[PDB]
Every structure is written in C-alpha cells, then in structure tokens.
Amino acid sequence: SSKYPRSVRRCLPLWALTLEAALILLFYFFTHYDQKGLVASYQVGQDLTVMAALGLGFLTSNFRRHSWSSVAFNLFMLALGVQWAILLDGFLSQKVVITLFSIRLATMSAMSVLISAGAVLGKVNLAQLVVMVLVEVTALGTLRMVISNIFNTDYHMNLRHFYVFAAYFGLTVAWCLPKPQRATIPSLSAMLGALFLWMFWPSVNSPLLRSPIQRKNAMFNTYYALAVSVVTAISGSSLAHPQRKISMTYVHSAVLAGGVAVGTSCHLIPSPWLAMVLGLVAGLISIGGAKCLPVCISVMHSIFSLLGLLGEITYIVLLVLHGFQVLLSIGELSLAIVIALTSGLLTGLLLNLKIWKAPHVAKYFDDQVFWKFPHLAVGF
Amino acid sequence: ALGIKSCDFQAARNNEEHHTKALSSRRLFVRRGQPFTIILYFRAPVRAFLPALKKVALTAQTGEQPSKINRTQATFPISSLGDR
C-alpha cells in the first residue's frame, strides 16, 4: 500500500457540499423561526460554543505535528454537528422551532461528538470525522428518545448522560481503528484550551435546569469541585509518573475531573463541602487511573470514561437520599452504555471502509497528510 | 471445458538440469530449491487463459500421511505472483 495520501480533491468537497445542501434543504422544509432576558439566555449558549470551539479544539492540539488538523477539524465538526443536531432533535422530539435554547441543546449534542473525537484525532481524515459526527449525533438522539419513551423522562433532559455516552463512543470508535509526540507551544495552546474549558464548565453543568435556584447551586458545586480537582490533579501528577515530574498532558485532561464527577448531580448537592469531597475523589481517581490504566489507546479518554462512570455512580448514590429508583437509574445507565458501545462499533466499522481514503498508519498525527506546505513534491 | 489429457514431466531435460541425468531419463529426479519444467496437455482447446489459470491449483504430497504442519503437503496456485 502507498503511504502517500490519496487525492481528496473530489471526495471531500463533494461530500461536504452535498451535506451542506442537504442541511439547507432540510432547514427550508422543516424549520421555522421562534425577550426581557434574551442576552442572559444567549450567554449560556455562547459559553457552550466558546468551550466547544476553543477548549475542545486546542485541548487535542498538544500533538507535535497535528495541531492544525485538531483545531480546524474540531471547528468543522462543531459547525456540522450543531446544524445536524437541530434537525435531529426537532425530528425525535415531535416542524422545528429554532430558539436559543434549541441552539444550546444542539451545541451540547455537538460537544458530545467533539469529546468523542479526541480519542480518534490524529488517525482519521475529515470525511471519517463527518461520518462519525452524523452517526454519533443520530445515536445520541436515539438514546435520548428511547430513554424518554421507556423511563417517561424528557427528551431534552436525557442529555445529562452525554459525558458517559461521548466517552464510551469515543473509546469504541478508537478501538476499531487500525493500530499506529509533544511540543512546548502546542502544549501551551492545549493549556489555554483546558483553561477555557475549566472556567466555563459550570455553564455546561447547568444548561438544562429551568429554575434559577438549581442553576445557581449547580454552578456553585461545579466551581468548587473544579477548583478542588485542579488542586488535586496538579498535586498528584508527580506521584503517578516514573520521572517524578508534573505531566502537562495529564493536567490538561484532569483539570475537568471534578466537573465531570459532579456534572450529573450538581443540583442535588445540598452543600459545597460535598461538592469539594466529590472533586477530591475525582482527582484521586484520575491519579489512580493515570497510574494504572496504561498498564491494564488514549489514556485521557479512558480516565474520562472512568470519571463519567464515577459521576453516574455518585448520582445513583445521591438520588436515593433525595429500590425501584436505583433499578431504573441503573437500567438507564446500562442502556446508555450498551447503545454507546454498539454505535461506536458501527461507526468504527464504517470508518474502516476504503472509500474514505483514510491516512496510512505510518502517517498518523501529521498535518502533512491534510494540509498544504511549501517546498513539497506534490503528485507523481 | 478444462479437461486434462496428459502431463509430460520432461524427465530427461530436468534430470540433466538438476544433475540427476545418471539416475534415469524416464523418472523425474529433481533437487529442492531449483525449478523444473512440466508440460500439461488438455483434451480440448482452452478458450480464455486467465479464468482457466484461476481455476487450477497444484498440490504436492509426500509420505503416507501428508499434512501442511509436517510440511509434507503444499497447495499452490499456478500464477506469476507465487513465491519462487
């Protein structure tokens, strides 16, 4: 097989333009438009957009020669995912009325895919990412619809499982990919992205809560848990390292451990000390996973999945205080995990198709595959 | 449409090339690692060479209980991409 990348001058433009034309046609046929707090409602969605673009594009840009692709592909995936998620959430919760709240929900749905893509960035091209975006948005919408139909929950309120869904979907897709690093300036850019994610994660911890009191309590808990998690992660990076130094890449992923741990139950926490305890437990679990998971591909995605599972478990624990309820919650969690694994397997099987012109395994984590650089021999 | 009439092993030429000419000119004595030439005759003319080439495979067996794990049996196709 030729290690030189195949020409995508006819596959990628045709695919992207066809997707955009289909999106425009569907918006024309199925979408319709529509006060005092318009700016206040827009600010939450703006924070979600800022996270999804900046933090999730630069957080994976820590690679030595794959930061361009990480950032630009994250932007492209967000732009496609919001547009497709608007239509999918309109279809599965019913025409589609487009509001700021629907834009916020589609932004969360795209954030799920952006989190999943971190396990597969550096090993796929743009068309495979488009396929992953479409399939993952459809699978998350189907999971939310099934949960709403079975457990009598709300379709928009089933978006709380997006941490665990994104993590397991990303791991499952990365498992199916063919088997195959850092620099200072890309690490600083990833630190900027991680800082933005850490600062604005309280917004993503309460976009679905309606009452102001629950949102305020959730933001308090997320803020304190995130502070505790940052302290614990920066402290314990030296413990879980053979060189006895602090790993910047580990910090980039473990800054968010407390926010992930308290994400599903930030409104149920009645006092900030419990949130701080949860953040400390999240940080210690992150240290343990960083020290143990590589022994038994993406370590950060694996510890993110472990943190999401821990957050679900502590939600189960906290829900009892505030038999059949535990069974319903565990069944919902198991259904989410099974659907995420099945959809990840399907997406990985579709991503191995030869028609996508995937990069060679020896050309992984390189921007030279997808980007033009001067003084290069082109073609044969 | 691909019947086999006979198979000429060309014992004399191969034995002279494989330095076994003093053994016999009728039986085929060949040495390992060196090519030997045989001629395969068909009862009927072959219309298309490539499909018929894809339809034929050769098997060499030695011993009373040939097997692939014992390296006493080997099945190989007739093609130019084979491992010489």
Partner: protein, 451 residues
Amino acid sequence: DAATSFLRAARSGNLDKALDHLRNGVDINTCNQNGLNGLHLASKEGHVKMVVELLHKEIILETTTKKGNTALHIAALAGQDEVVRELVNYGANVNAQSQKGFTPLYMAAQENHLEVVKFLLENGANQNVATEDGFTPLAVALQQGHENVVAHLINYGTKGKVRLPALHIAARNDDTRTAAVLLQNDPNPDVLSKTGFTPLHIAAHYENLNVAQLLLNRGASVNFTPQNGITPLHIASRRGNVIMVRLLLDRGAQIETKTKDELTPLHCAARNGHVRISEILLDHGAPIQAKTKNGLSPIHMAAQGDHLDCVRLLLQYDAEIDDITLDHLTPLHVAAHCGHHRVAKVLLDKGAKPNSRALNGFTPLHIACKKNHVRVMELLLKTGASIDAVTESGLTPLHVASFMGHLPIVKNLLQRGASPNVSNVKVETPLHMAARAGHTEVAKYLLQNKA
C-alpha cells in the same frame, strides 16, 4: 483499450494479465495521460514482482512522467522500500532530478521515510542537491519536523557510496537477468568498486559461471589488473575454482601475470593445495620456477601449507627440489620449520639434500630441533642428516635443542649418540645453553648422560 487494461493490471498488481497483454503485443512503454507507465504504477503500489517482470521486459528504466518523476522518485515518495531497493539494484539513478528539482532523497526525506533515506544515502544519493527554490532534503526534513530524518542526514553527512556497484552485487548473486538489464543500461562491464575490482573478480571469487560468461561476452577484460596486481585468474586459482580457471584460460587469461608481491597464479594454487588448478596451469605453460619478492617458488608455497599432493604434482613437473629463497631456505627447510613431516618425507624420498645450509648455516635438522618437531628430526636422521652438523656459529642440533628446552628432542639426540661435549664459537657447551635459559630437566639429562 488493451493498453488501458495493461496499465490497470500494473496498478492493481495483476501480473498475469499484464504478461498476457505483453504477449498479445501491447507496447511495454505505454503510459496514461499523466505519463505514468506500467513501471511507475507498479512502483507506486509496491508491486515488487511486477517491477521485476517489467524490467525483464526491456522497459525504459529512466522514463519520466509529466512532472519529471522517474520510477525511483515515485517509489521514494510512496514509501516503498522494497521497490526502491529493486530499482536501485537494476540501475536507477539515485541523483535524478524532476522538473522542479526534486530528488528521490528529497521525496523520501519530506515524507518521513527513514528507511528509504538510509538506503539512498548508502547508495550514493547526494543530499547537497537542491531544488529550484534552493531547498535541500535536510531543509525540508527540518521544516516538516521529521526529527529522525534530520538526525540521520546530519550524522551521515558525506560518507558517500558505501554499497557495491549494482553489477558487483549481480555478479555476487549470479543474477543473470539483473546483470543483463544493468549491461543494457550501462554498456561498460568493467565498472570499478572502491577497492578497484571489476565484477569479473567477484564472479571468479564465487565461481558464478553464468554471470562471468555474460560479462566476458559483453566485453569484460579477462586480464584486468588493478593496482595490487590481482587478476581474476589469480582469484580463481586461489579460491580453488577449477571450472572458472578453465573458463578464464579459454577466454585468454595471461598465465605469467604477477601481483605486487610477484605471486603468479601457480603460487596461489600451490599455497592453497589446489592440485587440479596447478596441473591445468602447468599444462597451459605456467612457469614452475617463478619466484616471489622473497624468492619463494610454488613448491615453497605448497610445502608451507602442508599440501602433500601439490608437492607431488610439482615434483612430477620437474620442479627444483632444492630451490632456495633469499634466505637460502629449501622446501625441506620450510617443511622442517612448519613441522610437516609428510612433505619432508616426500622431498627426501625424491633426492632432497638433508644437510642443506641456510644463510646462517642452519640445516633442516637444526630447524626441526629448534621448533620441537620430533617427527621431522627422525625422518631427517633416517635419511642421512648429520647429527653433529654445525652452523656458522658452530651450533649443533643438541645446542639448539638444549637452548630451546625441548626435552624429548634432547633425549632422542643423546640416545642416538650425540656428544654433549661439543662447543660453540663461544666455546659454550649444550650444558651452558641449558643453564643460561633455566632448563633444569634438560641440564639434568645432559649431566646424567655424559656431562
């Protein structure tokens, strides 16, 4: 349409379809709209067998596409290490430049193909060749962040061609097809390696008769003499290649050629014990009394190596049995020095003088007693060697044996009646020699016998 099918088969690796199309009459040098022929398409997809088959079909190796890229350029850009090796072995120019000045080394360096970079650098690729924009493989490797390529390019520098020429490799492996393709490309069969040897020298070394005959038919020099004077006939005689010796003599090899040490092929055959080669050379007119810079004749070489049958053959061809070197060493002296009692017996049975004198008056008996060679001593004493013979310094064999401490030789000499009362020019006795070297046992036996 048939040419299109042939190109598609070349691209897809279907060698049978390509061979069928070539048999039907499809032009071998056909190409698509981009100028890529079957060789280019095969090199892009890593089909080594297709490349070999097309090269065997007299395809033009140095064909360039519309971008100026050869097959080697495409193979280096695609990262096909095996195809790059095969193309280089068949004579691809590693320093060829494209329209914009790109080289195969540049294409391998820009795509982080470290193995291809290593192979091209070992095969003579010049990293100092720049494109039309002034960029170098080192510069483009630095630009793209290929750290291993940069490190290897810096470390290698200008080490140059460390590999043999492709014709030498073909002659080593007796590859007649590769050699035929190389000679079709480069008509000269006498290409020189860094050591100075032609591929005919390699063919004679390994007795690769087929490639040697091919080179001799294409116009190779059968008597090509490098600075060291080692002809292919010399190598064939030294290596024991009888059939190669016969082939070289049939093609017109000179038999009296001397190396820088004045070694004839007869000397090389005799020092290694090749009786058949020596007989063939002597039947073709090899001088049997040729002497090297040290005065050694072929019989000296045969006696040095304990080559008994070679000594017999040389003596059968009227060799001087008492030929002397610059040190006046007869072949009997050489046999005594090396301890070859069989060679000494053969020489003595045919009339070699047992009491021949060297420069310092040493007899073969003296040298046999010096080197603790008891069997040679017994054979010489049987054949009339003087047990009381003296050197120019008056040294008896007992003197030398006592000084060297060889107790069994001293015991045998004293049992055969040698007198320990003999004296040197310094009047010293064998007891003096034993006492001056601390040989307690030899001195004790000398005291017990007659001292």
